[PDB]
Design a protein around this ligand. Structure first.
Ligand SMILES: Nc1ncnc2c1ncn2[C@@H]1O[C@H](COP(=O)(O)OP(=O)(O)NP(=O)(O)O)[C@@H](O)[C@H]1O
Ligand SMILES: Nc1ncnc2c1ncn2[C@@H]1O[C@H](COP(=O)(O)OP(=O)(O)NP(=O)(O)O)[C@@H](O)[C@H]1O
Ligand SMILES: [Mg+2]
Ligand SMILES: [Mg+2]
Lengths: 606, 139, 604
């Protein structure tokens, strides 16, 4: 029936693109620099077919000359320029982008990638300026002045009083009274360093003697061939994307050319920073607060990601939720996993990486699952056969004998406390290597891995069964019942402190030891839980061939199960085993009181 | 042009030990993990240059008083030739709380690097010392 | 020169407002509910002056009718409706908001607060639907059909094939072939429970016999005064904005007026972002971490305001200085909220036992309310073993000669109640606090003073005032034990700074202190135990039989004796355990203990 076309209220649409969008006011410079960048791309694309387009002005630059005397922030470029007709349709019409139309008219096989594709970025300058005087000059027209007051109309006058520029556009921005912060040297350089740092064309800034200073001295490296970039060029690039003072340890520059084409130069720092990965679209900084881009345990990696086919919003400050950021997350981890493998091929280079990001690699084994087996290859720990140098889980299974089917390890508070633990002599007799875990995050990774190349990870501090022959198993069972009256006597003395007293043959040099059990937390795990700022069971064991325990066997034979003298030494031996196994005493005062009694009798103190 | 910043960290260490932290070469390498000293002397002297953090940080002790003053000519390798900064350290040890508040009056830094050297000072100079030597709780 | 007015490319502006404005595509239902809520406010504003305006449709509701077999998602309301001119001027023109013009035409002082003020939210429905068939009906006009397919033009035709509705608007949305996920039952309830949960009008949903289920049973409580809201209403409000099924421990409902007018109903859970933002009775965002501090982020609730500069997409707000103003009002209201809980005894026990970390983190992080949060801390002491006492009650029991607050850290309460550092303070009737959590020392190292009293940690070295006659008797005894103190230094070596005589140990033979600076005995235990992340002084007691026996050993020439080294090294490491220091090489310590047990058993 009645057919009507959609309309747009000018006096209301102008406000919706100023005071409702572009939540940040400092991005007005990011749009004007980008608008000057595509203008330099148009005049450059015409240079390959007609070199006479640059005879009016050969230099291509973006000059910014602040004038605090008249409260004006001038931005001058040497782009293609706009004619009288272009100042009316391309700049005077909302959502009309002359740059987007130029991209559709490019020849087959073009290499230029322009930024402007919406047609509303120019109107962002009104956030800090009340009126603008755009002075344009094209080779096919005269020099005109485009003046506006952010109202409902604009005025186009022929230039007769300003400078007779050769080619480009001059934007006279009369800044507001409350927005005079953009007239200083420091504030302008903060916006360029944040948004327009990697512009291909030089950005000149007039600083006050009048002199020019190029802000974008560090050119991006994702456009160049990765095989042609030297190591020193990656160091200067790392000092620009991040404020770190240390040179990068390893650089991974890859480029995926599948369904989603994007470049990424990921750097590995020398020290842990405790986002870090920036996102760029057509040489323009978009944002750096992408959650699903990089995992949590991988946040130590720095670098940038340059893509083209990304759903930019009106403000160009975020990406749309189109379910495309997950494939970038997969490729980043896929390349960094291989990047860590390339570091592992070098002996000295891996020592600096593992000593700086030891907890970062082990953290991925705890939460991440798809690359849990790949991160197990990077784990390096000390052992009884590798006390000096570090060894990996791959080198561990190569030294495992033919009759060993489990990987033995031990946790503790320090390395010196676990190197002489009484739990090692049980495996040293069988010539079994036992890894050393000295970091609080070590056990969190082994509890999630639980297996490496078919070998089950077993903790020696917990209860476990060691293989024995039929000739030795018969000798143990005959001796267990001999110490059965002693094990029951040790249970009534300790009471509910331990679940049971079992004769364990996994103790050679120590008279007694205490294990937590088979399941649940270990001895070191519960100690860490009770020590976190944001934040059990015991099994008592004795060695039947030690002179102390054998002397206690005859104590109960003469009716000394409830003797007064045996109660002091049993509690002393129990609390002593808590220190060697990694437990904490219930009260150190009572433990020191029993020790001071032995010191008194040792000095003949009555 | 250049500008200047003002930092005021608090350390739980007296001025007798904190003053030797920035001079003892054996202790400087602890909280820096990378140092290049050109003099065989055990302690830093006046007009003595030394490179830090893989040679990117060049510093030179110009003048210093006994546990009260520390003046260094800090300069970054990424900076240009005429750019050069000067760090002025003043000790304000307070015996009532058993701590030392080191007033740092840093001048001579560029206008665009005033936040770069400030964000790294609380990581490579403040937090690095509080973590290696334990001069205060970090959280 | 020639003056030209601004224009807009219609064929290109439509693609920008729809595709490159909103990040998510599920918020199209939120805007249609808000447009329906604004239409219901227009007919309600005319009802107070003319009751006949509700004769056609007496009930005011918002109905949602999903049709999977037809791929049609109908959203019907009973608002004021749109006439023939409103379908072309208001609905057909981009950036034209008839709701904003209605708010400027009414008399000054109206209670209505409508939502729509931009004029481009209606076009958000095209993100999931290719063609729309909006049908309108007004009391002063006939029933028309507004059909559009997000093209360059639209068509308005008189309705002669659909049913005759009384009053309201029927928006028929033909969803796309890849957006049929919005035709289910849970997906519709998920968007309502996320963006339009607290709409003042009931939202009806036709679910499968066909029945209508209301999706906004819970009404907003910030539109009512705290004096006429019962306790049970706050419980259902908390269980609707969150998922926990336990009643709030305490509720803080305040309202700030003046230049900034906003209301917030903050809740305190019973156990351990969370603060939602609502503008025009519509959820805006919950990712504003700058609104509430991190240490105080354990509370939940909502914040209602009307003067916030919302984004064009309405998914967030612009950078403004009002956020810091509301951040100040939220903290100051929660500070007094904790004081009202402190006035009670049984209610504060559940609050402190559940949020002990959050209160102590504010003393470490925040520097403005550090003195206010210090009065909320509760700890144990020698004068209060069962009941927890505060820092304010602590200075009330301090004598006239005591000028410092004494405390002690440790791994557990049983390890610090029998600590060898208490016998000195208990003899002088000096109360000493007990710290059991790892986060306690992080708060006392920042406060360092409470009401002028300096916080002194007894595990570190410190001096107590005494008479001049007693000091003259102690200084002459130190030089007597001077050969003994220097003898223990060469034995221990670099394990400690120095060996000095201490009179703060009555029963214990010896102990290890700190050096007044750096990490204490307990602090270093916490730093070396974090999964994601000093100097010690050895002292002896001259009134113990063990140390007195070592005094005659150095007199007979046993300063470098081998038999005494097995005891002074064992006495040193056993004192490291009672002070809280880490025991290096526990195997060597246990071997020397096993040798003493062998002597007790008469075996070599
Ligand atoms: N500095 C300039 N020099 C020459 N032409 C310019 C300049 N700035 C803008 N233009 C022209 O004016 C048009 C309008 O651009 P603008 O309104 O800034 O949005 P856009 O850059 O085209 N797209 P977007 O960057 O996503 O907002 C551009 O397409 C150019 O043709
Ligand atoms: N369901 C409806 N019933 C009646 N009138 C409606 C309805 N939906 C929209 N309108 C009218 O159409 C106009 C256009 O609204 P719309 O394009 O959605 O933006 P807005 O709601 O006015 N402002 P905003 O919500 O911030 O985008 C409204 O101002 C109403 O007058
Ligand atoms: Mg633009
Ligand atoms: Mg709307």
């Amino acid at each position: 029936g009645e057919t009507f076309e959609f309309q747009a209220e000018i006096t209301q649409l102008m406000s919706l693109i100023i005071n409702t969008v572009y939540s940040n006011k400092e991005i007005f410079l990011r749009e004007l620099i980008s608008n000057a960048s595509d203008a330099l791309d148009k005049i450059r694309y015409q240079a390959l077919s007609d070199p006479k387009q640059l005879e009016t002005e050969p230099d291509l630059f973006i000059r910014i000359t602040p004038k605090p005397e008249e409260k004006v922030l001038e931005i001058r470029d040497s782009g293609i320029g706009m004619t009288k007709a272009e100042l009316i349709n391309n700049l005077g019409t909302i959502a009309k982008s002359g740059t987007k139309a130029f991209m559709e008219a490019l020849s087959a096989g073009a290499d230029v990638s322009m930024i402007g594709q919406f047609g509303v970025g120019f109107y962002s300058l009104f956030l800090v300026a009340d009126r603008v005087q755009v002075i344009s000059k094209n080779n096919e027209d005269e020099q005109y002045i485009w003046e506006s007051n952010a109202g409902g109309s604009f005025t186009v006058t022929l230039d007769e009083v300003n400078e007779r520029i050769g080619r480009g556009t001059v934007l006279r921005l009369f800044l507001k009274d409350d927005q005079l912060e953009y007239l200083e040297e420091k504030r302008i350089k903060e916006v360029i360093k944040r948004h327009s740092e990697f512009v291909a064309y030089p950005i000149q800034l007039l600083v006050t003697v009048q002199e020019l200073e190029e802000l974008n001295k560090t050119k991006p490296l994702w456009t160049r061939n990765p095989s042609d970039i030297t190591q020193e060029e990656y160091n200067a690039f790392y000092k620009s994307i991040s404020n770190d003072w240390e040179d990068p340890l390893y650089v991974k520059h890859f480029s995926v050319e599948g369904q989603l084409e994007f470049r990424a130069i990921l750097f590995i720092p020398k020290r842990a920073p405790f986002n870090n990965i920036k996102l760029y679209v057509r040489r323009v900084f978009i944002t750096d607060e992408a959650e699903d881009l990089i995992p949590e345990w991988l946040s130590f990696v720095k670098g940038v990601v340059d893509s083209e086919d990304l759903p930019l919003n009106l403000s160009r400050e975020m990406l749309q939720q189109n379910k495309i950021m997950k494939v970038i997350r997969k490729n980043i981890v896929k390349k960094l996993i291989e990047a860590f493998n390339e570091i592992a091929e070098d002996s000295e280079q891996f020592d600096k990486f593992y000593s700086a990001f030891a907890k970062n690699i082990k953290l991925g084994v705890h939460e991440d699952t798809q690359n849990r087996a790949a991160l197990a290859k990077l784990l390096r720990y000390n052992s009884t056969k590798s006390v000096d140098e570090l060894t990996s889980l791959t080198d561990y299974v190569t030294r495992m004998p033919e009759h060993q089917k489990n990987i033995y390890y031990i946790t503790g508070e320090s390395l010196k406390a676990v190197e002489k633990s009484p739990f090692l002599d049980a495996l040293k007799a069988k010539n079994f290597e036992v890894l050393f875990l000295t970091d609080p995050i070590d056990e969190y990774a082994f509890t999630q891995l639980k297996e490496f190349e078919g070998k089950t990870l077993v903790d020696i501090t917990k209860d476990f069964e060691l293989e024995e022959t039929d000739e030795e198993k018969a000798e143990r069972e005959k001796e267990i019942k001999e110490y059965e009256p002693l094990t029951k006597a040790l249970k009534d003395i300790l009471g509910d402190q331990v679940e049971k007293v079992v004769v364990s043959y996994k103790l050679l040099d120590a008279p007694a030891a205490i294990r937590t059990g088979q399941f649940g937390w270990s001895a070191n795990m519960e100690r860490i839980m009770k020590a976190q700022a944001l934040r059990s069971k015991k099994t008592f064991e004795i060695s039947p061939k030690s002179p102390i325990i054998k002397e206690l066997k005859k104590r109960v034979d003469e009716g000394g199960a409830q003797d007064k003298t045996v109660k002091d030494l049993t509690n002393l031996l129990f609390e002593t085993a808590l220190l060697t196994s990694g437990f904490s005493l219930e009260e150190p005062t009572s433990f020191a009181s029993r020790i001071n009694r032995l010191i008194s009798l040792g000095l003949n103190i009555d | 042009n250049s500008t200047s910043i003002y930092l005021e960290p608090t350390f739980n260490v007296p001025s007798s030990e904190l003053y030797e932290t920035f001079l003892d070469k054996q202790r400087i390498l602890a909280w820096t993990r990378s140092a290049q000293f050109f003099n065989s002397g055990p302690k830093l002297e006046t007009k003595e240059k030394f490179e830090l953090f893989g040679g990117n940080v060049i510093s030179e002790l110009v003048s210093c008083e006994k546990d009260k003053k520390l003046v260094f000519h800090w300069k970054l390798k990424d900076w240009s030739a005429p750019f050069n900064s000067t760090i002025e350290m003043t000790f304000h040890e307070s015996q009532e709380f058993h701590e030392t508040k080191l007033q740092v009056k840093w001048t001579g830094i560029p206008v665009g690097e005033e936040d770069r050297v400030r964000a790294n000072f609380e990581e490579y100079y403040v937090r690095s010392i509080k973590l290696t030597f334990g001069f205060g709780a970090v959280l």
